[PDB]
Symmetry: C3
Subunit: 36 residues, 3 copies
């Protein structure tokens, strides 16, 4: 049913969110290099 | 039903696509640093 | 039915995984710059 699907979708949302935080930290490193 | 699920899946696809574009821009910054 | 949904979910999982590998390679470049 939808239970397996909803849990798979919730797990991918959490993975995407954790990747986004790591991508924002890389963006902040470039900002810090670009402004001395 | 599938309506809530399909909309959740479409929203995650758009989020993943927007993260990919930001990741390609970081990749281009490294390419520009590596070639002077 | 679930067939279209499950295949869409599997395709997004593979895309997210491939983006994660590219994000880990960018993280390794910063580690290599930060340690000489
Ligand atoms: Cl980066
Ligand atoms: Hg993602
Ligand atoms: Zn970088
Ligand atoms: Zn700036
Ligand atoms: Zn190059
Ligand atoms: Zn280090």
């Amino acid at each position: 049913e939808w239970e397996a699907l909803e849990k798979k979708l919730a797990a991918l949302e959490s993975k995407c969110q954790a990747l986004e935080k790591k991508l924002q930290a890389l963006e902040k490193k470039h900002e810090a290099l670009e402004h001395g």
